[PDB]
Design a protein around this ligand. Structure first.
Ligand SMILES: CC(=O)N[C@@H]1[C@@H](O)[C@H](O)[C@@H](CO)O[C@H]1O
Ligand SMILES: *[C@@H]1O[C@H](CO)[C@@H](O)[C@H](O)[C@H]1NC(C)=O
Lengths: 438, 52
């Protein structure tokens, strides 16, 4: 058989349901979402980190001329200077009054420690969601893990269970993200091939150990103006460091729905939003014929006491008269309330209790014990303790917070002025005709 | 040391402090809603929750 059901997407909130077939007793069916897994597809754009200014010692051509030459190194800057007078601990290095000239060049390379301090830019898209389900039926449990896409089933005991698609798409990840040292940051990193000094992505390499680098960081040389030999370079502050200083809070402290984000797959986990439609197929052997199923006679409710608590605090008792010793299922077919146990023992004339969680003060619904229904109602009071972290709202509020007394007052309030106007018009026309008699 | 207020959400709130793991705290209603068989100012309850 096949049965469809909509389940809220939230961990640790079991959903109870039944399946009805003529000649077969109901089969209790519990669905639990063990943990969600949102994994988006990503593409590596580039990697960056704090850099290091290589400054090879200046070339010196003494008492003659020289010309600058470009190179393929990143941010390579070259400049000649005539009229220089190199001096060193040994004294004057070489000799011609201003005819000499020295060539100074500089470039940029990633620092060795970068091997652990790197920050990688990424582009993400097409978020996909993976759900782990645990399904219990007939005191037999099965585990499964399926893509939320509703064309691929889960493989477990050669059983096929389709799931999804999500009702409302949600993805905390933005189009551009940046990951560094296990932390995810939401940031619009500059596109590859476009640099801007003093900002993130000043140094960009296709890979951490890529011989080819592209980067511009506004390195300008200065003319030597000291006795000795010395190449003075002026440069803008490294962009990566300044991004580090004011990077803001990471994405852990901003993701809605409390998504726990892990880096090595770059995926969110264990977080709730929307609904999931799922169709479950059950092998026929699982069902048990009603002939051997216990039959309950003269069932009756009793609400010993109820509390309109967030957690599961409401109580209930049932009195039954049966004929065969066995087990039957149990459930509450009103969405406003959820029971705790699904199957229970039955005796000839025994009575049994149950714990249930509600969400409306006027706890009135039909509870089905084993093969037969029973209506029953009671009133619940709000709880004293008004803050807890345990599972809450096993059913969402459905404007059922209105009490029966409130409905009675509303009914007694509204007046039937329509009947009054109708009677007034009728008597008006009757009197008009009577006077028209004259 | 000081005291800090936090408007816990109607549906939940996360709490991180120090280097130990966080805790999740949610809320429910606690106003005196249902009457006791006599006339009562029930509106106040529904004013505390869903004031609009
Ligand atoms: C001293 C030397 O090596 N070069 C200088 C040059 O920098 C300067 O511009 C010029 C007068 O303007 O006198 C010479
Ligand atoms: C599951 O329920 C059936 C129905 O009463 C029972 O016969 C069977 O023994 C139960 N299985 C276990 C493991 O309790």
């Amino acid at each position: 058989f096949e049965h469809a059901t909509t389940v809220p997407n939230v961990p640790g909130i079991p959903y109870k349901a039944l399946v009805e077939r003529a000649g077969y007793a109901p089969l209790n069916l519990e669905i639990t979402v063990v943990s969600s897994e949102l994994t988006p597809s990503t593409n590596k754009e580039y990697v960056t980190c704090k850099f290091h200014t290589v400054v090879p010692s200046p070339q010196v051509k003494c008492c003659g001329s020289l010309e600058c030459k470009a190179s393929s190194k990143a941010d390579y800057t070259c400049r000649v200077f005539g009229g220089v007078y190199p001096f060193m601990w040994g004294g004057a290095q070489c000799f011609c009054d201003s005819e000499n000239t020295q060539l100074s060049e500089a470039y940029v390379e990633f620092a060795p420690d970068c091997t652990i301090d790197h920050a990688v830019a990424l582009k993400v898209h097409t978020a996909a969601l993976k759900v782990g389900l645990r399904i219990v039926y007939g005191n037999t449990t099965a585990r499964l893990d399926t893509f939320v896409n509703g064309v691929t089933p889960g493989s477990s005991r050669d059983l096929k269970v389709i799931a999804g698609p999500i009702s409302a798409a949600f993805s905390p990840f933005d189009h551009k993200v940046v990951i560094r040292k296990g932390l995810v940051y939401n940031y619009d990193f500059p596109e590859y091939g476009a640099m801007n000094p003093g900002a993130f992505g000043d140094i960009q390499a296709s890979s951490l150990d890529a011989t080819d680098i592209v980067a511009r960081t506004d390195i300008r040389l200065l003319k030597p103006s000291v006795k000795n030999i010395h190449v003075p370079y002026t440069q803008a502050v490294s962009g990566y460091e300044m991004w580090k200083n004011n990077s803001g809070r990471p994405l852990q402290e901003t993701a809605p729905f409390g998504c726990k984000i892990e880096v090595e797959p770059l995926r969110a986990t264990n977080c709730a939003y929307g609904h999931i439609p799922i169709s479950i197929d059950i092998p026929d052997a699982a069902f048990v014929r009603s002939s051997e199923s216990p039959t309950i006679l003269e069932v009756s409710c009793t609400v010993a006491d109820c509390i309109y608590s967030a957690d599961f605090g409401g109580s209930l008792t049932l009195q039954y008269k049966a004929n065969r010793e066995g087990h039957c299922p149990v459930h509450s077919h009103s969405t406003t309330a959820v029971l705790k146990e699904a199957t229970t023992h039955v005796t000839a004339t025994g009575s049994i209790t149950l714990h249930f969680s509600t969400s409306s003060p006027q706890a009135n619904f039909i509870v089905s014990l084993c093969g037969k229904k029973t209506t029953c109602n009671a009133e619940c009071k709000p709880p004293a303790d008004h803050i807890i972290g345990e599972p809450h709202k096993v059913d969402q509020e459905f404007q059922a917070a209105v009490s029966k007394t409130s409905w009675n007052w509303l009914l007694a309030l509204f007046g039937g002025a329509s009947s009054l106007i109708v009677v007034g018009l009728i008597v008006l026309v009757c009197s008009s005709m009577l006077i028209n008699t004259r | 040391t000081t005291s800090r207020n936090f408007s816990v959400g109607r549906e939940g709130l996360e709490y991180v402090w120090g280097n130990h793991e966080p805790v999740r705290v949610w809320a429910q209603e606690s106003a005196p809603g249902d009457p006791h068989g006599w006339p009562h100012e029930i509106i106040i309850h529904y004013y505390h929750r869903h004031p609009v």
